[PDB]
Design a protein around this motif. Structure first.
Motif, PDB file in Angstrom:
ATOM      1  N   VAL A  84     -11.502   0.205   5.503  1.00  0.00           N
ATOM      2  CA  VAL A  84     -12.223   0.467   4.518  1.00  0.00           C
ATOM      3  C   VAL A  84     -11.759  -0.046   3.090  1.00  0.00           C
ATOM      4  O   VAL A  84     -10.651   0.319   2.673  1.00  0.00           O
ATOM      5  CB  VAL A  84     -12.429   2.028   4.430  1.00  0.00           C
ATOM      6  CG1 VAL A  84     -13.337   2.255   3.423  1.00  0.00           C
ATOM      7  CG2 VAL A  84     -13.200   2.272   5.787  1.00  0.00           C
ATOM      8  N   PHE A  85     -12.624  -0.569   2.367  1.00  0.00           N
ATOM      9  CA  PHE A  85     -12.195  -0.852   0.998  1.00  0.00           C
ATOM     10  C   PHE A  85     -13.042  -0.478   0.115  1.00  0.00           C
ATOM     11  O   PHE A  85     -14.316  -0.410   0.323  1.00  0.00           O
ATOM     12  CB  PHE A  85     -12.256  -2.507   0.754  1.00  0.00           C
ATOM     13  CG  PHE A  85     -12.375  -3.160  -0.672  1.00  0.00           C
ATOM     14  CD1 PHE A  85     -11.014  -2.960  -1.385  1.00  0.00           C
ATOM     15  CD2 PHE A  85     -13.458  -3.388  -1.304  1.00  0.00           C
ATOM     16  CE1 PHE A  85     -10.963  -3.365  -2.475  1.00  0.00           C
ATOM     17  CE2 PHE A  85     -13.193  -3.959  -2.684  1.00  0.00           C
ATOM     18  CZ  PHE A  85     -11.968  -3.560  -3.421  1.00  0.00           C
ATOM     19  N   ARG A  86     -12.595   0.768  -0.922  1.00  0.00           N
ATOM     20  CA  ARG A  86     -13.441   1.406  -1.347  1.00  0.00           C
ATOM     21  C   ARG A  86     -12.974   1.793  -3.001  1.00  0.00           C
ATOM     22  O   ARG A  86     -11.664   1.698  -3.189  1.00  0.00           O
ATOM     23  CB  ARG A  86     -13.500   2.873  -0.914  1.00  0.00           C
ATOM     24  CG  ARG A  86     -14.260   4.123  -1.747  1.00  0.00           C
ATOM     25  CD  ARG A  86     -14.360   5.271  -1.334  1.00  0.00           C
ATOM     26  NE  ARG A  86     -15.276   6.077  -1.804  1.00  0.00           N
ATOM     27  CZ  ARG A  86     -16.292   6.703  -1.348  1.00  0.00           C
ATOM     28  NH1 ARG A  86     -16.964   6.155  -0.415  1.00  0.00           N
ATOM     29  NH2 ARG A  86     -16.870   7.508  -2.222  1.00  0.00           N
ATOM     30  N   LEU A 124      -5.144  -9.523   8.002  1.00  0.00           N
ATOM     31  CA  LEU A 124      -5.394  -8.444   6.970  1.00  0.00           C
ATOM     32  C   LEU A 124      -4.402  -7.551   6.244  1.00  0.00           C
ATOM     33  O   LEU A 124      -4.729  -7.015   5.400  1.00  0.00           O
ATOM     34  CB  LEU A 124      -6.741  -7.702   7.389  1.00  0.00           C
ATOM     35  CG  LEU A 124      -8.108  -8.532   7.694  1.00  0.00           C
ATOM     36  CD1 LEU A 124      -9.122  -7.387   8.151  1.00  0.00           C
ATOM     37  CD2 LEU A 124      -8.371  -9.439   6.303  1.00  0.00           C
ATOM     38  N   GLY A 125      -3.228  -7.529   6.845  1.00  0.00           N
ATOM     39  CA  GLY A 125      -2.461  -6.347   6.626  1.00  0.00           C
ATOM     40  C   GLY A 125      -2.628  -5.344   7.512  1.00  0.00           C
ATOM     41  O   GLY A 125      -3.583  -5.009   8.353  1.00  0.00           O
ATOM     42  N   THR A 126      -1.512  -4.438   7.790  1.00  0.00           N
ATOM     43  CA  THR A 126      -1.729  -3.275   8.648  1.00  0.00           C
ATOM     44  C   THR A 126      -2.927  -2.453   8.131  1.00  0.00           C
ATOM     45  O   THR A 126      -3.173  -2.272   7.133  1.00  0.00           O
ATOM     46  CB  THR A 126      -0.484  -2.552   8.433  1.00  0.00           C
ATOM     47  OG1 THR A 126      -0.288  -2.008   7.136  1.00  0.00           O
ATOM     48  CG2 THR A 126       0.874  -3.338   8.786  1.00  0.00           C
ATOM     49  N   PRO A 127      -3.630  -1.824   9.355  1.00  0.00           N
ATOM     50  CA  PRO A 127      -4.874  -1.063   9.045  1.00  0.00           C
ATOM     51  C   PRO A 127      -4.501   0.123   8.288  1.00  0.00           C
ATOM     52  O   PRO A 127      -3.572   0.996   8.947  1.00  0.00           O
ATOM     53  CB  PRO A 127      -5.324  -0.918  10.447  1.00  0.00           C
ATOM     54  CG  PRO A 127      -4.169  -0.753  11.168  1.00  0.00           C
ATOM     55  CD  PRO A 127      -3.194  -1.967  10.617  1.00  0.00           C
ATOM     56  N   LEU A 128      -5.075   0.713   7.201  1.00  0.00           N
ATOM     57  CA  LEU A 128      -4.641   1.608   6.586  1.00  0.00           C
ATOM     58  C   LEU A 128      -5.368   2.810   7.260  1.00  0.00           C
ATOM     59  O   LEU A 128      -5.046   4.217   6.776  1.00  0.00           O
ATOM     60  CB  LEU A 128      -4.859   1.574   5.072  1.00  0.00           C
ATOM     61  CG  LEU A 128      -4.086   2.831   4.297  1.00  0.00           C
ATOM     62  CD1 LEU A 128      -2.562   2.738   4.235  1.00  0.00           C
ATOM     63  CD2 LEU A 128      -4.553   2.502   2.645  1.00  0.00           C
ATOM     64  N   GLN A 159      -9.047   3.125  -3.199  1.00  0.00           N
ATOM     65  CA  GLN A 159      -8.857   3.717  -1.895  1.00  0.00           C
ATOM     66  C   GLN A 159      -9.002   2.791  -0.783  1.00  0.00           C
ATOM     67  O   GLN A 159      -9.788   1.788  -1.019  1.00  0.00           O
ATOM     68  CB  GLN A 159      -9.907   4.951  -1.400  1.00  0.00           C
ATOM     69  CG  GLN A 159      -9.664   6.185  -2.188  1.00  0.00           C
ATOM     70  CD  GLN A 159      -8.342   6.930  -1.840  1.00  0.00           C
ATOM     71  OE1 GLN A 159      -8.216   7.665  -0.942  1.00  0.00           O
ATOM     72  NE2 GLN A 159      -7.122   6.296  -2.641  1.00  0.00           N
ATOM     73  N   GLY A 160      -8.212   2.859   0.301  1.00  0.00           N
ATOM     74  CA  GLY A 160      -7.981   1.708   1.498  1.00  0.00           C
ATOM     75  C   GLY A 160      -7.238   0.695   1.190  1.00  0.00           C
ATOM     76  O   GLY A 160      -6.480   0.647   0.113  1.00  0.00           O
ATOM     77  N   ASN A 161      -7.526  -0.410   1.693  1.00  0.00           N
ATOM     78  CA  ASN A 161      -6.891  -1.550   1.600  1.00  0.00           C
ATOM     79  C   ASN A 161      -7.823  -3.016   1.263  1.00  0.00           C
ATOM     80  O   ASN A 161      -9.000  -2.776   1.441  1.00  0.00           O
ATOM     81  CB  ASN A 161      -6.202  -2.190   2.932  1.00  0.00           C
ATOM     82  CG  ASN A 161      -6.943  -2.139   4.157  1.00  0.00           C
ATOM     83  OD1 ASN A 161      -8.431  -1.976   3.818  1.00  0.00           O
ATOM     84  ND2 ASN A 161      -6.459  -2.061   5.443  1.00  0.00           N
ATOM     85  N   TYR A 162      -7.268  -3.717   0.604  1.00  0.00           N
ATOM     86  CA  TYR A 162      -7.886  -4.712  -0.073  1.00  0.00           C
ATOM     87  C   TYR A 162      -8.539  -5.677   0.846  1.00  0.00           C
ATOM     88  O   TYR A 162      -7.919  -6.205   1.735  1.00  0.00           O
ATOM     89  CB  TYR A 162      -7.088  -5.433  -1.063  1.00  0.00           C
ATOM     90  CG  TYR A 162      -7.758  -5.833  -2.435  1.00  0.00           C
ATOM     91  CD1 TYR A 162      -8.657  -6.955  -2.435  1.00  0.00           C
ATOM     92  CD2 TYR A 162      -7.457  -5.278  -3.785  1.00  0.00           C
ATOM     93  CE1 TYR A 162      -9.173  -7.172  -3.724  1.00  0.00           C
ATOM     94  CE2 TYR A 162      -7.847  -5.532  -4.905  1.00  0.00           C
ATOM     95  CZ  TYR A 162      -8.951  -6.507  -4.769  1.00  0.00           C
ATOM     96  OH  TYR A 162      -9.491  -6.942  -6.021  1.00  0.00           O
ATOM     97  N   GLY A 219      -2.915   6.183  -0.217  1.00  0.00           N
ATOM     98  CA  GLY A 219      -3.892   5.504   0.583  1.00  0.00           C
ATOM     99  C   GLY A 219      -4.401   4.394  -0.248  1.00  0.00           C
ATOM    100  O   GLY A 219      -5.572   4.163   0.049  1.00  0.00           O
ATOM    101  N   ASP A 276       3.814  -3.800   5.169  1.00  0.00           N
ATOM    102  CA  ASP A 276       2.898  -3.897   4.163  1.00  0.00           C
ATOM    103  C   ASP A 276       2.710  -2.488   3.351  1.00  0.00           C
ATOM    104  O   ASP A 276       1.805  -2.393   2.593  1.00  0.00           O
ATOM    105  CB  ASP A 276       1.635  -4.154   4.698  1.00  0.00           C
ATOM    106  CG  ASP A 276       0.697  -5.230   4.001  1.00  0.00           C
ATOM    107  OD1 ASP A 276       1.181  -5.657   2.980  1.00  0.00           O
ATOM    108  OD2 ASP A 276      -0.451  -5.394   4.564  1.00  0.00           O
ATOM    109  N   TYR A 287       0.842  -1.395   0.096  1.00  0.00           N
ATOM    110  CA  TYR A 287       0.083   0.164  -0.218  1.00  0.00           C
ATOM    111  C   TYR A 287       0.808   1.249  -0.151  1.00  0.00           C
ATOM    112  O   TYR A 287       1.947   1.432   0.803  1.00  0.00           O
ATOM    113  CB  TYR A 287      -0.934   0.138   1.192  1.00  0.00           C
ATOM    114  CG  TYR A 287      -1.947  -1.262   1.335  1.00  0.00           C
ATOM    115  CD1 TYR A 287      -2.713  -1.341   0.405  1.00  0.00           C
ATOM    116  CD2 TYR A 287      -1.540  -1.995   2.420  1.00  0.00           C
ATOM    117  CE1 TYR A 287      -3.662  -2.472   0.602  1.00  0.00           C
ATOM    118  CE2 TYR A 287      -2.382  -3.097   2.371  1.00  0.00           C
ATOM    119  CZ  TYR A 287      -3.330  -3.360   1.655  1.00  0.00           C
ATOM    120  OH  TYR A 287      -4.192  -4.620   1.560  1.00  0.00           O
TER     121      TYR A 287
END
Lengths: 777, 364, 108, 89, 220, 60
Positions: free
Chosen positions: D53-55, D36-40, D11-14, A351, A387, A325
């Motif tokens: 949030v996945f957008r 899930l991976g690090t929280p964005l 936007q956000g993470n998958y 982001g 990540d 990311y």
């Protein structure tokens, strides 16, 4: 023995304290002759001088070092092939720092170092001689001169052990040349150390592409004639054998994309092996995972060879790794351009997951913006996180603004002016402005252009322009327009824009092709005279559409292009009309290798009055010339001028106001001079086919074709009832056409075109031109 | 070009003398095109008053040593062969190399190919024939001994190769059943000819004066053996004399380094990096006389003839130098585009091939 | 459009205060060919400190367009605080005329 | 109601059904960050709540969002989970 | 350029210093470089270097002033007036930030590349935290107070662009960055409405209400 | 050289508004602060703007 004090003299380069702290044994230490010799070794280490004398006549030691000029400046003789910056950087890296100690030994060493450099860059037989001169207070100046003969010429490349392929073909694929034809004397013959490695990898690529998977360059070497002009390159080969490609298999940590990888890794069974398509397969794998957010997948093909079966099973091992990311996008070196001027261009969001192709096409978009000399990305994992990454773009902002100003002065003519200010990237905000002017002696021209490429962030540009022209037929016009232009797909683009144009027409020759137009305006000037003057003010709604799908650079192979533009006068214009236009192109390959292509082209146009007015003659269509149909002089194809007899011609006869002159004929001129038509049709069929005057290494560099061009231009409302004695330009069936050949070439900065055509069907007065040449189209 | 073809060698102006010996062409013949601009070892050969000669294009011709008329001609090429290595003769066989790793043996009577085989890479060396073996040095530093009757390899030896060679010509020589050979690495070596066993080898030059040029050290000269002493001579290295068996250096000279030395009367005759002719004693190389007048007028292998040293230059003159003092004796006519290959020490005859392929018979 | 041009320079006196120049330009868009030769001199009335940037020249020009034109001229050049400046005077041998010209041009 | 060609704003993470169904109550913060991976995004204002949030807003029009939010007791133990599968406009 | 006679180094120093007092930096720079070249290790070397970094600064030779300052702090890290050299490194980096936009000043360039402002902030803060007695400390403090605001305006400009693009997670992340790095400044208080908007567009209404609470309690 | 303005000592930075820390409403905390803190140590003796004798010390 113990020394209580140490004595020095001179201390030109180093102070007493620094010298004392540098040496191993210092004041008050127990010392002997060996420790004194160690201090002399320290004096060597500081590297000033070596000759020394010592004395121990008491409890203190006296030591001195002979002083000579050592601190050296550097100056060079005439260097031809190796440039100044290369020379000086090499010198500094060697160890001869400017304003630093130097010695005869150092001079000899740097001599041999410079020789090694010259021979490394392939200036064999070179010689280096260096000398120094004294300067007051321990300084010197270093003067070094070089002699260097003819650069080494590669006499031959001699591939050996090749079979099924000739040496001349393989070396044709080399960038090195053992011979340069007298057709191409601008070629090159110079040896280079690293280019040989690049060409050996090209030879390996060639054999792997033909399928010789066992191919090995089991020895490669260079030799040098005793007279060191001639270099010989020789290369051993074994191919082993030719191999078929068996079914690919994919293994490893696939992230559930197994279907989209298997359908990508298909091959027909028994296919002939090829190294480039295997590399393309692996690259498409890692591109595919890249699109779905795996920035750093590992892939590795590891073929298994069946020497008995002549088959290779290409194993591909894949692991997607982990998602990445973008937490930050950064820009650096952006001293001037507003930051939004960079961010708006790129496709990678912040982001969001990292699309490794989105970052690169962002960098491509920043290059194609043009404000920057260079753009280069970096990407760094943030500390403590598995990540997510920063991506950072370094740039060099080019100097985009320009300013030119000019004055002229003369005899038999007055003062002249020019001016031209322009700057794309205006004050960094990414506007482009330009203001341009030209006050001649007998003309005035000025225009102002401003275009905002992002009137809304989606990419809608808003342009505006203002212009003025006047002359001393006598013409003046000035006007403005604004246009909105905004893409609708990657291929397909649309734009629209209002405009306004005043013009004043005066002192024009009376002729049938426009007097009926003036009559439609209610302007009824006398046909005997040239006192006429007409004034009008167009308000206009312009529009346009475009389509590009050509999928090629210099020479398109397949696909299509269409362009459409038009005008309508807004009600309340002092004249009222419309016109439309199409350009089209269509390339159809007739073999699936795209080596034979059928190219269709057309143009079209129509325009007419509204409300019973008539279209202004200065908006008429012209055809002919290489832009339209080849073998005709430009604009010649239209309907011809038919002048009325007019006195006071051009204010005085001057004996050359041909036809209908003050002393001319009683009746209408029916010139060869072409007016435009209000309607047009043009078509080409072009067949593109190379011929044996080629080599495959430039068969992409030259294209040849032959074509049938058709054209017609007519005057849809020409009144054939009044002028029935003159050729009916209302008739479209006067189609005229040519056939010919063309040749096209593509030097790096632009295409170049030759054509020959015969206008085998044409009518009265059409000015033929068999041989035609233009750049770029 | 912008390079202006600038001159830095400043070659010595032509020394000249009255033609005491009045050199003249007994006969001259063309054997094809020349070796031309490609440095290569092609030179004529002689047996029993039949001359043999060769062309880099492939053409091989046999000539009568007195008439110069053809006996036979063969094209020896596919419907170029890059012929190289140069002609050698033993018995009824004419042996020839190629820059495409072929070796040919042709019959002296008619030139029909008796056998042909491939060696490991270009065979830039002249084939050296002895007691049933044809010994050939290749550009890969391989020594390959071919069966004289059959062309199949008996044995092979590998010699190491520098990252940039000078010229792997380094033809071997044979003595008491041992073959002594040069090599691009600058080590003279000896091998037992029946079976290829390494006997001894010896380095004969310095190194590390440069990353390249000063460590160019190729022993591309033929060594020579007389009374049991081997002499060897190396491009940047010393002239050295060695025992046939010990491989120890008896003495070294810096006096000259490069080319095609010869020995007679216990005097060695030599050519240097810059074309100075000199004479040296066997008893420790010291200058007996020197002739530093020809520098950079690229000379050729000196041949001893009628009590003179004969050497051709880059532009067409046969310089004759006296055998016992360093003074010129004659200067033959400017011949076709100069010379770049050895004259042959034939008995009574001399032959030299100019770079255009003209053979010349020189007489007095 | 395309334009390509070449210039060569070769000094006559070994301090290079006297030097001679040849220039050729080719352009396509109608098309043009131009060839020029120029002689260059020390300046009349100011020291070498100014000579480092002020220049004076005499020139021959021949040109053709597809017209033929030929001219000979004296020229001054200066690198001003604003930007780089040319002044020129000409007396053409071939045919109103460009008897004086003044020209400033910079990228900002 | 606009036709101009936008790029794909994402936007956000998958997130996927396979990903989110890994999470269960009582996981420590490190284990769910690995899953899930690090929280964005995470709640800055003094609490442990995380926002996956996945957008996506690809093409010309239409937008999709999945909101998964996690909240943790101190020492990072996942105590409650909320998963809005679509933008409840 | 030409150089004066040099055998007494004191007189070439005195004339260089006179030219520096006059304000003829183009003369003082070249004559101090001449003195440095002719007597590089002489007693004047230190004061010559301090005059030469001053002439490079006032002459706007900022990358040479930077090189000379780094070289000076390397050569004498313990010099008793190294606080002045630290201050000059602050001024030279900040002056590299304050460039003209294509030769014209007064355009709000706060959202051009901040890296030189960031470096100037680092070097002023390294001064004030290290040499709190020095007379330059109060001016360095006012440079810091300006530079922090000038950095927060950059972060605000990026959050505003992502607001216009509709990249609401970039907007939220950048405004949270401002709230942790640059808490006590304008542009941050101007950015909080962007974060409240971004949360509301993502239907994260709880967070939007929290940010609206911060806005209300901190509303001017 | 483009920097001619700031190297004049423009003192335009001295107009810049003072820092004005936020306060947390009830039931909330602001994010934990970071390294870009301006230390509050100041001296009245220290001149500011054009008044500061930027010229190098008299005897380094």
């Amino acid at each position: 023995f113990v020394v209580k004090d140490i004595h020095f003299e001179g201390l030109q380069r180093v102070a007493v304290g620094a010298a004392l702290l540098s040496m191993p044994v210092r004041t008050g230490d127990t010392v002997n002759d060996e420790d004194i010799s160690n201090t002399i070794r320290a004096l060597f280490a500081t590297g000033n001088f070596e000759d020394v004398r010592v004395l121990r006549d008491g409890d203190t030691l006296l030591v001195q070092v002979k002083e000579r000029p050592t601190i050296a400046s550097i100056t060079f003789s005439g260097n031809k092939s190796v440039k100044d910056d290369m020379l000086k950087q090499n010198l500094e890296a060697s160890g001869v720092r400017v304003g630093e100690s130097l010695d005869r030994t150092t001079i000899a060493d740097i001599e041999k170092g410079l020789e090694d450099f010259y021979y490394s860059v392939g200036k064999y037989s070179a010689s280096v001689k260096a000398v120094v001169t004294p300067l007051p207070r321990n300084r010197v100046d270093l003067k070094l001169v070089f002699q260097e003969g003819v650069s080494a010429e590669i006499q031959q490349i001699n591939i050996v052990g090749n079979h099924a392929f000739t040496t001349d073909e393989l070396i044709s694929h080399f960038q090195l040349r053992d011979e340069v034809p007298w057709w191409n004397v601008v070629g090159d013959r110079k040896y280079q150390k690293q280019k040989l490695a690049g060409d050996l990898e090209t030879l390996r690529s060639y054999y792997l592409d033909r399928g010789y998977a066992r191919f090995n360059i089991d020895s490669t070497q260079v030799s040098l004639t005793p007279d060191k002009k001639g270099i010989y390159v020789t290369v051993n080969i074994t191919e082993g054998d030719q191999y078929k490609l068996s079914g690919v298999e994919v293994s490893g940590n696939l992230a559930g994309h197994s279907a989209e990888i298997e359908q990508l890794t298909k091959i027909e069974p028994g296919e002939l092996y090829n190294g480039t398509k295997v590399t393309k397969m692996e690259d498409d794998i890692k591109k595919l995972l890249g699109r779905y957010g795996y920035a750093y997948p590992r892939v590795q093909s590891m073929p298994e060879i069946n020497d008995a079966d002549k088959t290779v099973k290409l194993r591909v091992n894949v692991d997607a790794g982990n998602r990445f990311y973008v937490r930050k996008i950064r820009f650096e070196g952006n001293d001037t351009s507003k930051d939004a001027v960079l961010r708006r261009e790129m496709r990678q969001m912040e982001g969001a997951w990292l699309g490794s192709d989105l970052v690169d096409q962002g960098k491509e978009r920043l290059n194609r913006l043009g404000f920057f000399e260079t753009v280069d990305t970096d990407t760094q994992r943030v500390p403590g996180s598995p990540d997510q990454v920063d991506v950072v773009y370094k740039v060099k902002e080019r100097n985009t603004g320009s300013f030119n100003f000019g004055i002229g002065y003369g005899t038999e003519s007055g003062v002249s002016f020019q001016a031209g200010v322009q700057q794309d990237n205006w004050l960094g905000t990414g506007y482009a402005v330009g203001i341009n002017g030209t006050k001649n002696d007998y003309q005035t021209y000025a225009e102002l252009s401003v275009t905002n490429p992002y009137f809304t962030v989606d990419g809608v540009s808003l342009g505006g322009r203002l212009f003025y022209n006047d002359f001393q037929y006598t013409n003046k016009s000035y006007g403005t327009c604004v246009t909105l232009g905004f893409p609708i797909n990657e291929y397909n683009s649309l734009r629209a824009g209002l405009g306004y144009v005043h013009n004043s027409l005066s002192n024009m020759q009376p002729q049938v092709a426009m007097w009926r137009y003036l009559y439609s305006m209610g302007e009824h000037p006398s046909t005997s005279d040239q006192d006429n003057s007409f004034k009008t003010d167009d308000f206009t709604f312009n529009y346009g559409w475009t389509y590009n799908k050509l999928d090629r650079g210099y020479f398109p192979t397949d696909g299509s292009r269409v362009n459409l533009t038009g005008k309508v006068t807004i009600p309340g214009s002092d004249n009222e009309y419309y016109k439309v236009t199409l350009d089209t192109a269509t390339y159809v390959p007739i073999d699936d290798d795209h080596k034979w292509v059928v190219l269709g082209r057309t143009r079209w146009g129509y325009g007419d009055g509204l409300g019973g007015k008539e279209m202004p003659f200065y908006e008429n269509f012209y055809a002919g010339g290489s832009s339209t149909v080849r073998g005709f002089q430009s604009n010649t194809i239209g309907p011809k001028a038919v002048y009325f007899p007019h006195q006071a011609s051009n204010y005085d006869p001057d004996y050359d106001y041909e036809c209908a002159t003050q002393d001319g004929a009683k009746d209408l001129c029916k010139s060869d001079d072409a007016v435009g038509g209000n309607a047009m049709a043009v078509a080409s069929l072009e067949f593109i086919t190379p011929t044996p005057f080629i080599s495959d290494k430039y068969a992409n560099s030259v294209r040849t074709s032959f074509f049938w061009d058709m054209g017609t231009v007519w005057d849809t409302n020409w009144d054939s009832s009044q002028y029935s004695g003159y050729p009916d330009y209302s008739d479209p069936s006067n189609i005229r056409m040519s056939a010919g050949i063309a040749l096209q070439w593509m030097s790096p900065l632009g295409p170049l075109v030759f054509s020959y055509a015969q206008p085998f069907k044409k009518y009265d007065g059409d000015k033929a031109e068999q041989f035609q040449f233009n750049i770029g189209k | 070009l912008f390079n202006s073809e600038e001159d830095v060698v400043k070659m010595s102006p032509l020394p000249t003398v009255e033609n005491q010996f009045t050199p003249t062409t007994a006969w001259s013949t063309s054997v094809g095109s020349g070796i031309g601009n490609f440095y290569s070892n092609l030179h004529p050969a002689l047996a029993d008053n039949v001359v043999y000669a060769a062309d880099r294009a492939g053409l091989v011709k046999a000539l009568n040593a007195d008439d110069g008329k053809e006996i036979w001609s063969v094209s020896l090429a596919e419907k170029p062969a890059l012929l190289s290595g140069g002609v050698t003769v033993s018995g009824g066989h004419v042996y020839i190399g190629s820059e495409k790793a072929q070796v040919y043996a042709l019959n002296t009577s008619d030139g029909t190919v008796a056998w042909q085989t491939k060696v490991a890479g270009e065979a830039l060396s002249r084939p050296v024939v002895s007691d049933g073996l044809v010994l050939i040095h290749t550009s890969n530093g391989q020594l390959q001994a071919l069966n004289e009757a059959d062309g199949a390899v008996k044995w092979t030896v590998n010699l190491d190769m520098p990252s940039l060679s000078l010229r792997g010509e380094s033809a071997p020589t044979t003595a008491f059943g041992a073959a002594v050979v040069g090599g691009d690495n600058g080590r003279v070596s000896a091998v037992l000819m029946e079976q290829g066993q390494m006997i001894w080898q010896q380095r004969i030059s310095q190194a590390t004066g440069s990353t390249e040029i000063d460590r160019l050290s190729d022993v591309d000269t033929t060594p020579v053996v007389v009374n049991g002493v081997v002499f060897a001579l190396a491009y940047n290295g010393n002239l050295t004399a060695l025992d046939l068996r010990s491989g120890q250096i008896m003495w070294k000279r810096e006096l000259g380094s490069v080319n095609d030395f010869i020995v007679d009367g216990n005097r060695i005759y030599l050519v240097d990096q810059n074309d100075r002719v000199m004479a040296l004693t066997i008893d420790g190389g010291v200058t007996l006389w020197t002739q530093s007048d020809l520098l950079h007028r690229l000379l050729t292998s000196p041949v001893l003839y009628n009590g003179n040293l004969v050497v051709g230059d880059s532009e067409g003159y046969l310089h004759w130098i006296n055998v016992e003092d360093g003074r010129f004796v004659a200067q033959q006519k400017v011949d076709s585009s100069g010379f770049q290959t050895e004259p042959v020490a034939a008995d009574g005859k001399l032959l030299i091939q100019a770079k255009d392929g003209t053979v010349y018979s020189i007489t007095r | 459009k395309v334009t390509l041009d070449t210039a060569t320079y070769v000094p006559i006196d070994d301090d290079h205060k006297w030097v001679v120049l040849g220039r050729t330009r080719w352009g396509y868009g109608n098309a043009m060919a131009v060839a020029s030769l120029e002689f260059i001199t020390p300046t009349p009335f100011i020291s070498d400190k100014y000579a480092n940037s002020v220049r004076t020249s005499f020139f021959w020009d021949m040109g053709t367009v597809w017209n033929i034109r030929m001219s000979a001229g004296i020229a001054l050049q200066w690198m001003s605080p604003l930007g780089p400046l040319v002044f020129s005077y000409a007396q053409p041998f071939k045919k109103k005329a460009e008897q004086f010209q003044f020209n400033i041009g910079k990228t900002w | 109601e606009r036709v101009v060609y936008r790029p794909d704003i994402n936007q956000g993470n998958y997130l996927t059904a396979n990903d989110v169904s890994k999470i269960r109550v009582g996981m420590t913060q490190q284990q769910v960050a690995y899953a899930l991976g690090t929280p964005l995004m995470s709640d800055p204002f003094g609490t442990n709540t995380w926002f996956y949030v996945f957008r996506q807003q690809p093409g010309h029009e239409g937008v999709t969002q999945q909101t998964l939010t996690l909240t943790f007791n101190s020492s990072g133990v996942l105590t409650n989970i909320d998963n809005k599968p679509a933008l409840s406009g | 350029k030409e150089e004066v006679p040099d055998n007494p180094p004191n007189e070439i120093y005195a004339t260089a210093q006179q030219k520096l007092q006059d304000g003829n930096w183009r003369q003082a720079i070249t004559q101090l470089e001449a003195l440095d070249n002719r007597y590089p290790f002489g007693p004047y070397s230190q004061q010559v270097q301090l005059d030469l970094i001053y002439a490079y600064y006032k002459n706007a030779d900022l990358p040479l002033a930077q090189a000379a300052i780094d070289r000076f702090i390397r050569l004498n890290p313990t010099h008793p007036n190294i606080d002045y050299v630290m201050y000059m490194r602050g001024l030279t980096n900040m002056a590299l930030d304050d460039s003209a936009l294509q030769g014209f000043f007064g355009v709000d360039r706060s959202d051009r590349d901040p890296q030189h402002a960031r470096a100037a902030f680092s070097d002023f803060s390294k001064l004030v935290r290290g040499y709190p007695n020095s007379q330059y400390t109060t001016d360095a403090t006012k440079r810091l107070v300006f530079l922090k605001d000038r950095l927060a305006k950059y972060e605000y400009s990026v959050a505003e662009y992502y607001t216009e693009r509709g990249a609401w997670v970039a907007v939220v992340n950048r405004v949270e960055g401002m709230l942790r790095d640059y808490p006590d400044t304008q542009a941050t208080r101007d950015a909080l409405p962007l974060m409240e908007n971004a949360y509301r567009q993502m239907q994260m209404n709880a967070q939007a209400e929290k940010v609206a609470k911060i806005i209300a309690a901190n509303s001017s | 050289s483009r920097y001619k303005r700031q190297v004049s000592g423009d003192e335009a930075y001295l107009e810049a508004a003072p820092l004005a820390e936020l306060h947390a409403p009830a039931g909330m905390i602001l994010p934990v602060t970071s390294g870009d803190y301006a230390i509050p140590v100041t001296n009245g003796s220290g001149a500011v703007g054009k008044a500061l004798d930027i010229r190098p010390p008299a005897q380094p």
